[PDB]
């Protein structure tokens, strides 16, 4: 019986609503929950869902070199699978395995409508409008690791004000955008979700890069291939598209 | 020194044009050639390029269960890598390994501009306008394996006229579109390339599904992970985007 680590994130994973107390895996619904279920069927496994305890996706501390969050749990064999909006990044592929992507997205900008801002560059070359990303995120990491002119400057900007422009959750990042002169760097899929519930927000510019989400397995895990096949199957039969329709 | 199987296909791989004869790996240029080179560097390997002998990507005979083309070569350890516009399909993941995708595309329609046709459905529900795909392709296989109402219909149509509507190459498929009442089912990226060199063609409707291209390795190969890491880096540093710009 497989230990599946994950994390709360609308509409990927979230506590279901009801009137009478819920226990175990019934506590959860969401796109990733649906997906977990489909894989569960196709590959014939039983599974226990656990929320990652530190509440983080996965980042590496420069100095000591330790990993945290879901990625850490995978490394330690404390979980068998990580099923979340976990980005397939190359720093991560060096420590865990990933199924082929069940979703392709990209970094982009969340800002309110009708500003002159039209791209990442327009943000970089000024200072009035602040900007940031989820701290220890894949998105933040992209900027930290980037030797592209524009993004290096934008990183320089953020790392110098992390106290105030780097947020701890996609929610908090959206709140900043809505309550100050702030533009948020988040994933396109999540932007696409938010720009429905909030009608004064929009995606500025296009996709900055092009990552995917994948199922996290400890390195060398047999399920990496199994789950890749299952996912390829789910794409090809329209179920993944249907599932996104459903939650967006 | 790695044996790399591949296949001629504009602009992924093609004999380079000059005034003097070229030999060995100099014979070739193209997006995949550039890619091969970049991987070559990052992972430090030497390689010999061979064109797949039967001239096919990879399909499985329905009687004897045998594989052909590049996929076959990988299975037989006759080649170490397949670097081509080779689609990551689940039937294939069942016999070889694939790097994560260096390109994401989708099946779509190539037809003439200004027809009432606007989708795969509009094609299905009639017979005047014929349609087809590359025989033994990923695209053909998609329809043959599909249980979706519309596409089962379209498959029924093709398998009944397989001789006259299933073509042997992307080129021949385009030639049909341009010389008869015919709509072609090809990959979006290749459509995107063709609709520049031919100004009366266009993509009808949207992406029908959502596959990627990956580097083919024999199952259990060390390079699958290595090459996945190398590709992830190449995406993250803009090189893959630049490479597409260059060849499109
Ligand atoms: C929900 C957040 C915390 C996660 C989700 N994907 C990215 C990841 O895999 O790290 C993070 C977002 C980001 O950095 O934009
Ligand atoms: C160029 C053709 C023959 C190949 C390329 N990708 C698909 C494959 O990987 O089979 C085939 C095209 C298609 O079937 O639309």
Please tell me about this protein's structure.
Chains A, B: This is Glutamate receptor ionotropic, kainate 2. Chains A, B: Glycans are attached at residue 200. Chains A, B: Residues 116-248 are extracellular. Chain A is of the alpha/beta class and 248 residues long. Chain A has 2 domains: 1-105 and 211-248, Periplasmic binding protein-like II (D-Maltodextrin-Binding Protein, domain 2, 3-Layer(aba) Sandwich), CATH 3.40.190.10; 106-210, D-Maltodextrin-Binding Protein, domain 2. Helix content of chain A is 38%, strand content 19%. Chain A has 11 helices and 13 strands. The first copy, chain A, is globular. Chain A binds chain B through residues 88-90, 93-94, 97-98, 100-101, 104, 142, 145-148, 209-212, 225, 228-229, 232-233, 235-238, 241, and chain B through 88-90, 93-94, 97-98, 100-101, 104, 142, 145-148, 209-212, 225, 228-229, 232-233, 235-238, 241. One 3-(carboxymethyl)-4-isopropenylproline is lined by residues 9, 57, 85-87, 133-134, 137-140, 170, 186-187 of chain B.
In short:
Chain A is an alpha/beta fold and about 250 residues long. Chain A has helices at about 30-45, 70-75, 90-95, 120-125, 140-145, 150-160, 160-165, 170-180, 190-195, 220-235, 240-245; strands at about 1-5, 15, 30, 45-50, 80, 95-100, 105, 105-110, 130-135, 180-185, 200-205, 210-215, 215-220.
């Amino acid at each position: 019986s497989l230990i599946v680590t994950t994390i709360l994130e609308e509409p990927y994973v979230l506590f279901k609503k009801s009137d009478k107390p819920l226990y175990g895996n019934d506590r959860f619904e969401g796109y990733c929950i649906d997906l977990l279920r489909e894989l569960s069927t196709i590959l014939g496994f039983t599974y226990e869902i656990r929320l990652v305890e530190d509440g983080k996706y996965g980042a590496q501390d420069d100095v000591n070199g330790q990993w945290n969050g879901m990625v850490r749990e995978l490394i330690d064999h404390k979980a068998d699978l990580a099923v979340a909006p976990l980005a397939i990044t190359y720093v991560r592929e060096k420590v865990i395995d990933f199924s082929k992507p069940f979703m392709t997205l990209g970094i982009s900008i969340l800002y309110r409508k009708g500003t002159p801002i039209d791209s990442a560059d327009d943000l970089a070359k000024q200072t009035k409008i602040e900007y940031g990303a989820v701290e220890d995120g894949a998105t933040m990491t992209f900027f930290k690791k980037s030797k592209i002119s524009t993004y290096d400057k934008m990183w320089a900007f953020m790392s110098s004000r992390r106290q105030s422009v780097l947020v701890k959750s996609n929610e908090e990042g959206i709140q900043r955008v809505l309550t100050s002169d702030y533009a948020f760097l988040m994933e396109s899929t999540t932007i696409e979700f938010v720009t429905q519930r909030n009608c004064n927000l929009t995606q500025i510019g296009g996709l900055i890069d092009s990552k995917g989400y994948g199922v996290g397995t400890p390195m060398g895990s047999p399920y990496r291939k199994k789950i890749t096949i299952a996912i390829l199957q789910l794409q090809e039969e329209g179920k993944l598209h249907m599932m996104k329709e459903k939650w967006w």
